[PDB]
């Protein structure tokens, strides 16, 4: 939006939270003190509605972040979690019961899949899978006991973009009361306005772009009015919360999210365009790159891109080639996570990807390189990638 | 132990964590960088064994705390959680599946009960209850599908102490492979060496005495070798972790835990002795006070007391009397939680207690006052309590 | 071509990061010596990045110090509780009874007050110069002039020095004088002071380095000639910063390039728009043509930040000042700058005259200082336009 | 009867805590004024606890300042990056060219070095006195003596002043002199300096107030006569502490009483045991009978902390120093003190002589300084006994 940067700078900032400073105060607390029985009664009644009650419900610092997330993502409430994986697992758990069925994209984050197959399965909840490009044909997979439809767009690692309008419309035709969820981390919740598309809950690893500096972990889940109270109370029954200081740092990260994302978009698309012309590259998976799976949906449904994408090499690198390649970069660092200022590089063997694509078939045989494009000078990053190519030519 | 204070000062402090300082470093991270493919392979193999892999598994700061908790509580591993309630809920969840049965003391922390009745019940796991003084007679409640026996000693609010040796021995006779758990928060994990008694897992709201200052929330679960790997991996599948700074503050709280607990013991027992002689007091629930329920077990099985206890007034105070009493204390603060330097006061109506004692009957009709005795001068606290009594005489 | 890469990587060595992207936070007073020989080695190297005592620093400070030295091209970086402490203690480190300080009359007011209220009673005199004096500063250098203190752009009124002409003139008369600059507006990276022959570059890292209005810290990066005296005399005054703020300063560096580019783009737009506005008499922005010293900014800087000022076409009454300043929707009234929030402050001409020693001001309208943050510039323009309508 | 209650409650008002037990942490440079009138009011009250600018403080600092004033009985509390900064800047706030400072020759070495290496070149002279001089200090007061600087117990050698006799003597000759004390060993609460007619009580809050060896901060609590000058001259040098360390200092206060009682009990036991040991020539513990000034400690203090020293029955060789110090299991070799960890340091007699201006030392054995932490005292005794066996 033409006002997103203004919204990012101001979200969640009310005087009761900031008390004269630009940023919210950091209120560290378990105990929250009631001056009177009447104040305790009021706090108890409103213990889930932004009145100070107990640290597990939140302090002023959490309330400020929650207000900011609800403004930016257009929700009725925002639940907070110790990390992105906890947000996914506990948001699903909040809405299933024995006998229910979960329908999840087979490009979902691997720990999200493992939560379903290793935790939910033993509790009486089953999981089916769908191709990210299934579109309207997802109506054929919905069962009488299907309670949750779980999206992730772009998909993890391989970056396939859903046709969310087609998927949502099909779901609402067959099972209108289904809970549609999305892991919206890649878009940082702001490049894809999930709730505006009829999705019920938008989950983020705020660990990534919201924190923005690779030094804090936190999950968020913003729900519409229909689903908020069940999410809030069931997640609370699991004790899910984040510490006040990380909440403060997430609010703080919001303030620069627009400037950062614009640079990640510009730099990563430039890199992807170069890779797509490169003799040692077989495929480029960047939602903003014409030709990538689901690109047309990204162009239609997103307001921008972030900096995480991947590409396929011309070959399945051996262990020895992978070391020659990855061990000798000067700028890219080998690490998990993404969304920070540091450019990162991560390799996945085609067979490794096949193993996390349930009931699907991988359509590449070269090693998949996932890049996070950070804030470095893009020409320096290209030179680093070029040196890597020369080590394996 | 005659060396507990020395152990508390030194636990978890190895050079790889402290790097020259007295306290561990604070390493804030999601991304942890691998210098080489060989280093990444080593990190992956040992990602649950204290090698840096990914922030969700921990940084140096978490590893230091985990080592400290395992030393002090005599366990094989320590899982970390965003708060005490999350530790309880996810430690139980890590070991049950559809069709299992949980046997829990009916004096358990109310959110622990609610996790069982509102979350587990809809996932196919049932919960039965037992009186805290059931002792060896608990063998009669164990069912072929009973997987978890959940203790809490002293109990929440009413402070009844289990006969843990009797309970454990009975459980091992009937269902030797049962997972015995205890919420050991009141003892701060160190006044009752749960694992030495044959309990499998010792859970704490480190929020309380370990943090020690009412300004940080965190849960811990220390497991023996038999149960560690299931606890660790299933809790991780739920995304459970704590932030690095709170881990640092928990290690830091350990260093003064002995001096603090000795003062909480001395002051709270003095207060309890006075209350037990008081014309406006009907009953005193302090494990260290002769006559309290389970006291003989506390004397035999614990190495000390903390500062949390409760007493029963001569009457069920009306709302108006409760305000006259609680609104006008000068030192005691009305708040939830405990284990800090501030003395706290909290009232529970006898009928409120009855409502959180499933399949049991309350044996008092006066208002129950729970006190946390902090680090204030004990005579000032007695004067505050005396003024309170005069307001309701 | 490379500043953004340098900002991302500065100060990051494994001994400081230990596996993470950012340096570890090592909170410490006591630092433990395993042996007498280790203690002797730490003592010898207590100003050279071996752990010795928290007042000298921990790994977190060492990482920031290395980053600042790399980015500003210096031999060492002293750390301070705030920018004002960096200014006061850096000057103090190089003067003694009988010395003379020559300071631009556009210096930050607390810097001036340090000179007139602290240094003077300790036997150090201060004289003043117009910021556009250029080579004619040679005529003001006295036999006892020890420090020449620059600030470019100047505080509030934003005049840009001709640093090459000033430095050449100083070195002709007093080759060994200590030339210092408060380089906060450039965040130490838009103007590479040490490459111009300045000896010490001082920053309120509070501003753009922290970048979020929520941490205070001063830095002073010195060349090889001046470092040891700066380091040891600041240490004798106990000057340090806490490890956590040091960490947050290193962390701020990483986004400094992308932030500054936005502040530049937006503040230049606003300045160009104000320059055309009928209710504006003059715009003081280093990057705007016609502003005092603009030609030196264009020649000597690699960019602009977001702080500047303008003069209204009239002197506002007290009622008009309240109507104007009390009713902005986005601009906040506050001191400091360099964050994501846009800020506004007002000064009457006589207020500025009072902090322009031996000079008069050349305007009569109310002066407005703006910090242009990261909001959408069109929203900021609409906020300013609404303000103009309240005083028209 | 009430210190523990005071420590738990000091500085805690709803405007600072806003519902929590501890004060909020307000990180800020910029503090926002909603209106011109609010800005005027904040400006008027910028040293009196109205939010104005982060260099003056936020709510977190105000809470700590109120706590320190309540606990030490003062009119205001200035905050500094560390103890050495508090000492240096508190002295500097009250001197000018031509003044004379009279300091105990047992002062902390960096305090002495500030005087001889910074003040001297700024026209301020420093003279010295034996810590047991008592009323005879009157003979050392010069017409230009402005500051009398006490430290009781003394650094390392632990001599306790007769503060009533010193203060009475000073006030007879120079009633308006500024009497200051470095009151770190007493943590400001075991010796209520301002009640004895001292004007300013300075602490390295780094030590027992923080209490965990992981934060650095200085404080100076002044009476009504001296506060404004302290406050404003320290502010002109930019002296402040970050909000987070201020929070951690308030937090440390809450356990200070229970910690100090353990440090007292354990360090007195160790001192009594060392005094009986055949390899110990002398024990310097304020609470131990026979120690220099013990009678004044017993009369004037309400307790002891855990730092003291002793003299070995011989001068250790370099080989014996390594054998002794390199092989402790619990005691760590490090600077600072006041935490939960027990610490050990050694000094030869000539090292102490070098920091005893105009005095000679009266011992020839190696001096060992111990900080007694929170470990089990019998384990610490076993550690010390093993050390004795390594040098016997
Ligand atoms: C899409 C997505 N969802 C959830 C998560 C989990 O968030 P936390 O790491 O905060 O629990 C991640 C992190 N995946 C990282 C580790 C990666 O792709 O390397 C993710 O990429
Ligand atoms: C025994 C016990 N277990 C678990 C918890 C939950 O820990 P967290 O609050 O960190 O989630 C509490 C806190 N009960 C507090 C709130 C009380 O008794 O007031 C507790 O007392
Ligand atoms: C140019 C300049 N130098 C130094 C400082 C002092 O830094 P600290 O505030 O960290 O001590 C400031 C702060 N000026 C703010 C207050 C302003 O211009 O409003 C400044 O603008
Ligand atoms: C008495 C005394 N005053 C002031 C200070 C200075 O405090 P900072 O270290 O916070 O600047 C110290 C520190 N003395 C430590 C270093 C010691 O005696 O080893 C001290 O012991
Ligand atoms: N009034 C808001 C700030 C408004 C910000 C305008 N940019 C607060 O008190 O936090
Ligand atoms: N060697 C340990 C400290 C030993 C502490 C003895 N009290 C470390 O490096 O952290
Ligand atoms: N080797 C450096 C990191 C290099 C960063 C490359 N972008 C460290 O250990 O911190
Ligand atoms: N009223 C105080 C707390 C009183 C504390 C009583 N022990 C506050 O709001 O912080």
From TrEMBL, chains A, B:
This protein's UniProt keywords: Amino-acid biosynthesis, Cytoplasm, Lyase, Metal-binding, Methionine biosynthesis, Pyridoxal phosphate
EC number: 4.4.1.13
Protein name (record): cysteine-S-conjugate beta-lyase
Coiled-coil segments: none
Sites bearing N6-(pyridoxal phosphate)lysine (covalent), chain numbering: 208
Binding-site residues, Mg(2+) 2: 354, 357, 360
Reaction(s) the record says it catalyses: L,L-cystathionine + H2O = L-homocysteine + pyruvate + NH4(+); an S-substituted L-cysteine + H2O = a thiol + pyruvate + NH4(+)
Cofactor(s) required, per the database record: pyridoxal 5'-phosphate
GO process terms (BP): L-cysteine catabolic process to pyruvate; methionine biosynthetic process; transsulfuration
Matches recorded under InterPro entries: Cys/Met-Metab_PyrdxlP-dep_enz, Cys_b_lyase_bac, Cys_met_metab_PP, PyrdxlP-dep_Trfase, PyrdxlP-dep_Trfase_major, PyrdxlP-dep_Trfase_small
PROSITE patterns: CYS_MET_METAB_PP (PS00868)
Pathway where it operates: Amino-acid biosynthesis; L-methionine biosynthesis via de novo pathway; L-homocysteine from L-cystathionine: step 1/1
Keyword Metal-binding attributed: yes
Organism name: Klebsiella aerogenes (strain ATCC 13048 / DSM 30053 / CCUG 1429 / JCM 1235 / KCTC 2190 / NBRC 13534 / NCIMB 10102 / NCTC 10006 / CDC 819-56) (Enterobacter aerogenes)
Localization per record: Cytoplasm
SUPFAM superfamilies: PLP-dependent transferases
Positions bound to Mg(2+) 1: 10, 342
Sequence positions bearing N6-(pyridoxal phosphate)lysine: 208
Family label: Belongs to the trans-sulfuration enzymes family.
GO terms for MF: cysteine-S-conjugate beta-lyase activity; metal ion binding; pyridoxal phosphate binding
Binding-site residues for pyridoxal 5'-phosphate, renumbered to this chain: 54, 56, 83-85, 109, 207, 338
Top-level class of the enzyme under EC nomenclature: lyase
């Amino acid at each position: 939006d033409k006002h997103l940067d203004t919204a990012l700078v101001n979200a969640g900032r009310r005087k009761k939270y900031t008390q004269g400073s630009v940023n919210s105060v950091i209120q560290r607390a378990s105990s929250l003190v009631f001056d009177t029985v009447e104040a305790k009664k009021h706090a108890t009644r409103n213990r889930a509605k932004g009145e100070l009650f107990y640290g597990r419900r939140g302090t002023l610092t959490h309330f400020s972040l929650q207000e900011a997330m609800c403004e930016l993502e257009g929700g009725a409430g925002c639940a907070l979690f110790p990390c992105g994986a906890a947000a996914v697992a506990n948001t699903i758990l909040a809405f299933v019961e024995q006998g229910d069925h979960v329908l999840m994209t087979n490009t979902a984050y691997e720990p999200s899949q493992d939560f379903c197959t290793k935790i939910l399965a033993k509790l009486g909840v089953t999981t089916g899978w769908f191709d990210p490009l299934i579109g309207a044909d997802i109506a054929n997979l919905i069962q009488p006991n299907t309670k949750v439809v779980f999206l992730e767009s772009p998909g993890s690692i391989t970056m396939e973009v859903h046709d969310v309008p087609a998927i949502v419309a099909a779901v609402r035709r067959v099972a209108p009361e289904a809970i549609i969820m999305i892991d919206n981390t890649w878009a940082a919740g702001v490049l894809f306005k999930a709730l505006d598309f009829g999705i019920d809950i938008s989950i983020q690893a705020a660990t990534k772009y919201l924190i923005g500096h690779s030094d804090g972990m936190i999950g968020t889940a913003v729900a519409n009015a229909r689903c908020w109270e069940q999410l809030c109370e069931n997640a609370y029954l699991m004790g899910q919360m984040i510490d006040a200081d990380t909440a403060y740092m997430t609010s703080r990260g919001l303030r620069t999210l627009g400037v950062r994302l614009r640079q990640h978009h510009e730099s990563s698309l430039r890199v992807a365009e170069w890779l797509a012309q490169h003799p040692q590259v077989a495929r480029v998976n960047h939602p903003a790159l014409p030709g990538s799976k689901g690109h047309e949906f990204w162009k239609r449904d997103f307001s921008g891109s972030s900096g995480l994408f991947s590409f396929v090499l011309n070959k399945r690198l051996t262990d020895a080639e992978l070391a020659a390649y990855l061990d000798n970069f000067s700028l890219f660092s080998m690490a998990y996570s993404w969304g920070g200022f540091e450019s990162l590089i991560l390799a996945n063997q085609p067979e490794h990807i096949a193993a996390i694509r349930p009931e699907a078939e991988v359509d590449f045989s070269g090693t998949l390189i996932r890049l996070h494009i950070g804030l470095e000078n893009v020409d320096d990053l290209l030179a680093d990638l070029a040196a890597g190519f020369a080590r394996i030519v």
